[PDB]
From a paper:
The earliest discovered selective autophagy pathway in Saccharomyces (S.) cerevisiae is the cytoplasm‐to‐vacuole targeting (Cvt) pathway, through which hydrolytic enzymes are sequestered into double‐membrane vesicles, termed Cvt vesicles, and transported to the vacuole 8, 9. The best‐characterized cargo component of the Cvt vesicle is the vacuolar aminopeptidase I (Ape1) 16. Ape1 is synthesized in the cytosol as a 55‐kDa zymogen that includes an N‐terminal propeptide (hereafter referred to as prApe1), which oligomerizes into a dodecamer 17, 18 and further assembles into larger aggregates in a propeptide‐dependent manner 19. In addition to prApe1, Atg19 also binds another cargo hydrolase α‐mannosidase 1 (Ams1) 25, 26 via a site distinct from the prApe1 binding site, thus forming the Cvt complex.
In order to further the structural analysis of the components in Cvt vesicles, we determined the 3D structure of the secondary cargo Ams1 from S. cerevisiae using cryo‐EM. The images revealed class average views with two perpendicular twofold rotation axes indicative of dihedral symmetry and were used for determination of an initial low‐resolution 3D model of Ams1. After vitrification of the sample, we refined the tetrameric Ams1 structure to 6.3 Å overall resolution from 33,588 particles (and EV3A). Subsequently, we built a complete pseudo‐atomic model based on a homology model of the mannosidase core combined with two additional N‐terminal domains. For the remaining N‐terminus, we built two domains: a jelly‐roll fold (residues 45–203) and a four‐helix bundle (residues 17–27, 209–271) based on distant homology and the EM density. In contrast to the homologous dimeric S. pyogenes α‐mannosidase 32, S. cerevisiae Ams1 forms a tetramer. The transverse interface connecting two monomers perpendicularly to the Ams1 length axis is formed by the β‐sandwich domain and is located on the opposite side of the dimerization interface described in the homologous mannosidase structure. In addition, we identified an N‐terminal four‐helix bundle domain that comprises the major longitudinal interface bridging two monomers along the Ams1 length axis within the tetramer. In analogy to the mApe1 structure, a putative Zn2+ ion is coordinated by central enzymatic residues of Ams1 His298, Asp300, Asp411, His626, and is located in the interior of the oligomeric assembly. The corresponding SDS–PAGE shows that wild‐type tetrameric Ams1 binds MBP‐Atg19 efficiently, whereas the introduction of a W234E mutation drastically reduces binding. This suggests that the Ams1 wild‐type tetramer is required for in vitro recognition by the autophagy receptor Atg19.
Residue numbers in the entry:
A (entry chain A), B (entry chain A): -12 to 0, 45 to 63, 77 to 178, 193 to 203, 209 to 271, 287 to 678, 702 to 739, 752 to 818, ...
C (entry chain A): 287 to 353
The structure:
């Protein structure tokens, strides 16, 4: 059918010319800054040397600079020709043509790329290019030219490619075939006069339901990944330069940036001439900042304060010369989404959101891609969702009509959605031939509006103007309550808990000193008292490791050591330095000060004797048998049984072997008890397994009301040895029947069933959590507190916490070494149903005691008339510039009770203020809605 | 859905043990026979040296021998273990464990392979292995073991693979998944006791419409290909040895051999102990010789004599100790099939045929794969046709149920057809795990006959017993007249005509001396006279280059030089030596002898003046205008216009560029004339093209009845230069309307239309021919004689001959160099309609004249009373052992007239005898059927 | 490949529907008789009845020879 005759023939087979200049070429390498090397160039004879040939290398962390001094050949003849220099793209680097140094040019784009030499100025210039190693040898040759001949070659390549994508039943496929025919006729027998003429004839063969197809070129950059931050800091400057050279070459282009800190990275590295580059670039057009967010992160693990700073400290750039923005919120690589996001968005002045994964196309009780998200708070979020092709559809895309068809099926709207650029790497490239892409697509389809029109230059702001018109304001709409569920690729989330232990301890610790440091305002006045400039710098370093890829611990071994480096550590070390600092001139009013933040036995007979409860491990079995309440009457049989099953997948996802029996840790145990006291009781029982390894958990608790508490504390200490690729968990089967699982999400409590959605794919079902998870019919249940482990699962009502994971990924630090784990099991009652939530989250508190000399009185309870047990205040902090402070509260128990808010203060005034710390004229609500975040601001 | 959970997990992940013996290992290389190197081993210190490590190499025609002397480790412990030695397969070589030399062992099998060490004899032996280079470095390590553990690993690998092939809708897919589940359970945690036990449990999970699925392991070897004959002569001995070691390991196995000469190759190389190996091997069972043919060749290009010898001289082995045979005829790689094959088969005592390509599945006026072939002669041929999967379906096949489904659709029968082994390479391998393959397929499906039974041990002889029963004897059956048509991959058929020029001239030349050398029988008696032993050796060398791959000229450059070597040349040189030899004592009865075999002008006014016809080239145009008959009244406008179009494909197929304009050779020509005479007239007209090259054709003819002949002779001489990848043709448009094209096939004239079948795929349509092709409404037409070009095409009635082709294949000798071409154009009439056929074929005759001293009378016409113009006798020759001679005739004009045969002789008797030269009791027919080959034998 | 294809002939009768109970009471006796004539004609046949009261309906209407 002549299918392989037209397609594979001409696609393979003045005009393009290749000249070679061997001399004047220099090479440089550092085996030990662009401004530092410019002074080391002209002076004497340094490591800069003549290359003139291909330079091989070997694996190193070193970077290799390269210098090419080119003299323009002849005068007029080769000037009209297009000047070009081809380079082989290495792992990283930069390219410059500095005098002395004005420019910064793009590198990080794909292995194929073009560098244009200015035809405006006739003379000799210089070139500075470095190549990051990880080895990749560069192929460098000068390439002259024509533009019209190469255009036809590209247009034909995108022609026949579009012929294959078009339906064979349509006449267009037979048309495009005949179009690929006539072109091949004059193209074959090597004729320049025919090629240029045939290009004109092809255009004549080209030009002879309201819908729209658009796209926005973007670069998604991970600040920490298998390449480090310092190296990727050089990678982000390559993303800006590719646009700058594209602007003069092509107009109407659109770029978006998920990092507000990206601006600062460029302003710190290139403060001089590139601060004045951004202003005409951003203000006029062609640039948009999405979300104005300081960090792109997973929202499940951290608190709302992490989401509070990124909005506020990312809005700080708006105070500088900046501020052309968009209403879209972009978290493409983020796994999972919080249920408080619809509430956080509207308050942050951002009305749109984008989600890559976590969706399906079918009747789900859900129509399509485009979606209006209604959280459990009751608020609504209009969000724009890309199809199942994700962001890799338009990434490095020359295929034209290929994914255009697959985009139309999931989406209805009046139009589709395309995201240009790659989100996997040091940063995404932006192709320079996109100008022809938009043009050649306007060659196939006619102009005027009848058939869908092709415009790549439209902005999402105008796109959101279209959705406000076509579709109704709505009452009954696409509706999904809570979060979304698809293949999560949880992976490292529960793996390498040691980086969580450091972070989660640093999380609370940095969240510790915040508010109380504003309570010393009255004591010693200067600015009064608050580490405004001091704590601002603190949040700068912490948010850097909190990114979506970095925080769970999925990365190479090099940057993983930078996670356990002072980056995480010194934060705790500086905060523990400040907490011992501010105390000196403060606590001096305290003789003996207990510092805590709030606002108002037997062996053979196997018993630990007390009133509250009883939990018993059988003899020689090693497994807890009876957990039973006398007053309640609930008896348990199948507790705390540790289970170890291997893992055969990589760091990304988790895939267990087919029907693999999980090895129990039960063995010929021995019995022991740590101490002897009414205050302290710890009974020790040893567990062992094949390839002997010591797995230790501890038992701690306070009796009743001599010790006082309602909850046990069980901490696990395990030093891993030998066998890798294993996944360890501890089971807490409730032996109870409930279709609902109580779990506390970020700023609230979400309601999720015991069984996953019927559309679920992956066998293994695990859920990420903050602190505790419960099962409650409201008259009773079982509550499980935990530390350093964010994961858990619903087994058919068997509570299983994930202690450790060891992926087969190329990381050797995820396998062996000691670990300190902690968790708990708590008895549940209807009266204690609101108590278990209160005794869970903030239990991470660490007791600390210190005393100065005595002059004063140390008892002051300064909080004013609120007293709501159903509400919990997560964050209260100051401002930037005044020093007005903000107060943010959220209701713990919601969905049933309507919390009356009497919260107020004295000696000053108060007004309700959103999460962006921006002034809002409703006033303080006397009653809080269920599952509502209440944030306020305080002024003198 | 846990699809990638079960399939990709356990498939990747005493028992297998790897030991290393560095010492005692020797290596050898020849940079300059197995019997020659055995005397060079123990004596002194030769190039045989210690290796003990991996030996790298470089491109060479050399072979590298290798010696491993192994001592059995310990006594009992590692004896029970399976002894094995793994080698990396090179281009070619042999493997031996000689004492002194008994054995020959298999090598040529795939890169993975096993060599078993005998556990019967306890001691130390030697190993001799050579590696052919073309470089490939060998990896050699001793491997010990268990057999039960590895069996489960293979059975499981073929299990999950069968799970994917089975329909997901069926419960079998879900069953096999659960079967792959339970196995992975005990297999994962490294337990020998569990693996051996789980293997038993899996067998218990296995065992709990009449059809048959069978196959025969076979090796298709090309005697000359991209590797030469001398090197592949070592490759064929590796095919036999793989069976010999398989026989003791597994029974019921079946092997087939398309080469009868393959026996002789083994008997010449290994005459001593391997002559006694074949007799118990072939006679009992497990071996069958298909067709008993000396050569596997394309039947279109040569004459019937080439097909006559291969049957007869391949039946010579039957006279030795041999002769367990089959009725199947096998030409899998042969492109195209003759229409006389149904007649040739029944006479050769072979009733079945096999065809790979040239078929389609649809309603074609044709049901299925299985077919009863009715030739244009009227005879029927029952043939067995493999599906569209060809012979590569069961080739190297571990995939089990994969191609089992695709085999059932094209074929109905009661059963399908599978051909095991590869037909592409030096020779096909036969896998040793086929024993488990038949067994594991008997594990999935139960035993007894209900569902299709799996037997790989059945023979095609018994298979043809089944077809005689189930289906009817038949009247109306699958019917296809003439040849078959699918993608031909004509390719080199018209390319490199120089190897055709040598062969076609050698064809007739070897076909020349045959019969007349029996006419001198009476002259000088000893045996009387005939080169019985002399001409027998002649046909030995000639048939060697006549194979299907070798003859068209598709091959590497090395063996291509061996085509133009004395192999083709000396045949002509020896025959021209004998023709000048036998004449000396023969022609002496002739004073002056003309030796031929048979049985009874102007320029400016542009004219060559004579009576018969007129053919005129216009001035300055270079193109013939008017070819016109005065008596007939037919005028032609559009002759002999040479056309050059490029080619963008390889040697195999031919693919033109999409709508590429073919460049005409018309140019500013000049006029000239070779000689001046009534006997000799040649007018010269020059043609030229871009990148100037001289394309010359000549004009020769004899006037009427001073010169006498009815036909022109035009010979083309072109020396190729510069541009490659071109395809040259000369057009002879008839300017006439006919739906039928007259063409003379091998032994007859087939009838083919002007348009290809409606099921045809490839655009370009070209036909292979012997000598001439005509277009006749029987009152008139145009006849085209040609030489050295077997190709032509039907353009809508434009006659186009293919002068030369230059493929892009890795052969540099198909591009440039001079060529001598010849063809003709003949006027057609109803009375001359039988004349044109007679003046076409044998015109290749070359005039030769020589004279001795004079005593005698030189005129004798010895032929006795036949005189049939519609019949033509192609071959008459002698026998093997007596020296009785045979006479074979065939009717040229058939389909209309019934030829009365009065053919007989005197002084002796005559009986009808088939193509195998075997005695047949109907007698000499008085009348010959249309399109019938009549062969007879003569006795004293 | 071990597999089995079976079935059981059954009659699902609604005691009250677009036709009344008194009329369908005559309809249930037609379900039993079709089996009785089938038993002698063909063996191994299987019938099932979702109504235990179906027995009583037959025993009340035909108490004598059909018990």
């Amino acid at each position: 059918x002549x299918x392989x005759x037209x397609x594979x023939x001409x696609x393979x087979x003045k005009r393009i010319s290749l000249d070679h200049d061997h001399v004047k070429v220099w090479w440089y390498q550092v085996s030990f800054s662009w401004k530092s090397i410019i002074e080391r160039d002209k002076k004497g004879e340094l490591e800069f040397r003549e290359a003139n040939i291909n330079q091989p290398f070997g694996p190193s962390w070193s970077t290799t600079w390269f210098k090419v001094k080119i003299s323009l050949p002849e005068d007029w003849v080769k000037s009209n020709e297009q000047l070009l220099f081809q380079w082989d793209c290495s792992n990283e680097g930069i390219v410059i043509d500095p005098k002395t140094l004005i420019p910064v040019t793009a590198f990080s784009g794909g292995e194929r790329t073009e560098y244009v030499l200015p035809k405006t100025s006739d003379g000799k210039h210089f070139f500075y290019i470095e190549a990051g190693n990880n080895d990749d040898n560069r192929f460098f040759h000068l390439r002259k030219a024509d533009l019209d001949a190469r255009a036809l070659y590209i247009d034909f390549w995108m022609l026949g490619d579009a012929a294959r994508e078009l339906p064979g039943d349509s006449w267009q496929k037979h048309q495009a075939r005949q179009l690929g025919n006539a072109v091949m006729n004059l193209f074959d027998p090597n004729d320049r006069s025919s090629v240029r003429k045939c290009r004109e004839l092809l255009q004549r063969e080209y030009f002879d339901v309201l819908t729209n197809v658009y796209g926005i070129g973007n670069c998604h950059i991970d600040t920490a990944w298998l390449w480090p931050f310092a190296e990727t800091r050089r990678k982000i400057v390559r993303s800006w330069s590719s646009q700058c050279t594209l602007m003069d070459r092509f107009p109407e282009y659109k770029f978006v940036a998920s990092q507000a800190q990206q601006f600062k990275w460029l302003l710190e590295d290139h403060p001089e001439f590139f601060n004045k580059v951004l202003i005409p670039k951003i203000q006029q057009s062609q640039f948009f900042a999405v979300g104005g967010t300081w960090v792109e992160n997973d929202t499940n693990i951290p608190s709302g304060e992490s989401l509070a700073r990124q909005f506020f400290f990312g809005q700080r750039f708006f105070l500088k010369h900046f501020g052309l923005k968009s209403k879209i919120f972009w978290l493409p690589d983020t796994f999972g989404y919080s249920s408080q996001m619809p509430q956080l968005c509207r308050l942050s002045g951002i009305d749109k959101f984008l989600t890559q994964k976590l969706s399906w196309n079918n009747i789900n009780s859900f129509p399509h891609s485009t979606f209006n998200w209604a959280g459990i708070d009751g608020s609504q979020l209009l969000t724009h969702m890309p199809p199942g092709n994700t962001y890799t559809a338009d990434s490095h895309f020359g295929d034209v009509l290929r994914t255009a068809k697959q985009n139309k099926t999931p989406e209805y709207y009046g139009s589709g959605l395309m995201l240009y650029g790659k989100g996997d790497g040091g940063g995404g490239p932006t192709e320079e031939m996109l100008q022809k892409m938009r043009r050649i697509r306007s060659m196939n389809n006619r102009n005027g509006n009848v058939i869908p029109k092709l415009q790549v230059g439209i902005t999402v702001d105008e796109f959101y103007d279209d959705i406000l018109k076509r579709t109704n304001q709505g009452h009954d709409l696409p509706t999904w309550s809570g979060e979304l569920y698809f293949e999560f690729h949880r992976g490292t989330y529960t793996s390498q808990a040691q980086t969580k232990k450091l972070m989660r301890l640093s999380e609370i610790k940095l969240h510790d000193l915040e508010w109380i440091a504003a309570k010393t305002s009255v004591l010693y006045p200067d600015s009064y008292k608050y580490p405004s400039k001091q704590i601002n710098e603190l949040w700068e370093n912490v948010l850097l490791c909190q990114f979506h890829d970095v925080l769970p611990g999925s990365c190479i071994e090099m940057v993983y050591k930078y996670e356990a480096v002072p980056m995480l550590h010194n934060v705790v070390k500086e905060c523990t330095s400040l907490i011992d600092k501010t105390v000196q001139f403060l606590q001096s009013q305290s003789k003996a000060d207990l510092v805590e933040m709030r606002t108002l036995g037997y062996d053979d007979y196997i018993v630990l004797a007390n009133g509250k409860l009883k939990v018993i491990i059988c003899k020689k079995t090693g497994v807890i048998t009876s957990i039973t309440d006398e007053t309640l009457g609930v008896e348990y049989l199948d507790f705390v049984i540790y289970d170890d099953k291997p893992l055969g997948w990589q760091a990304w996802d988790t895939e267990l072997y087919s029907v693999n029996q999980y090895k129990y840790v039960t063995k010929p145990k021995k019995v022991q008890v740590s101490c002897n006291t009414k205050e302290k009781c710890a009974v020790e029982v040893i567990f062992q397994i094949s390839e002997k390894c010591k797995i230790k958990s501890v038992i701690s608790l306070n009796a009743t009301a001599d010790a006082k508490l309602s909850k046990v504390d069980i901490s696990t200490t395990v030093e891993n040895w030998d066998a890798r690729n294993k996944f360890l968990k501890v089971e807490f089967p409730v032996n109870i029947r409930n279709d609902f699982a109580s779990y506390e999400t970020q700023f609230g409590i979400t309601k999720r069933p015991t069984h996953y959605n019927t559309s679920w794919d992956v066998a293994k079902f695990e859920v990420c959590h903050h602190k505790f998870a419960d099962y409650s019919e409201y008259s009773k249940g079982v509550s499980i507190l935990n530390d350093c482990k964010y994961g858990f699962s619903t087994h058919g009502n068997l509570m299983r916490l994930s202690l450790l994971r060891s992926p087969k990924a190329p990381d050797a630090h995820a396998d062996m070494g000691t670990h300190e784990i902690k968790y708990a099991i708590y008895p549940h009652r209807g009266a204690l149903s609101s108590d278990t939530v209160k005794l869970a989250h903030e239990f991470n508190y660490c007791f600390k005691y210190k005393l100065p000399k005595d002059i004063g009185m140390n008892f002051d309870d300064i909080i004013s008339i609120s007293g709501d047990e159903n509400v919990i205040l997560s964050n209260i902090k100051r401002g930037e510039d005044e020093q007005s402070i903000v107060v943010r509260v959220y209701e713990s128990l919601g969905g049933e009770s309507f919390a009356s808010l009497n919260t107020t203060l004295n000696l000053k005034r108060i007004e309700k203020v959103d999460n962006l710390e921006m002034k809002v004229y409703n006033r303080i609500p006397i009653k809080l809605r269920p599952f509502e975040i209440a944030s306020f601001r305080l002024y003198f």
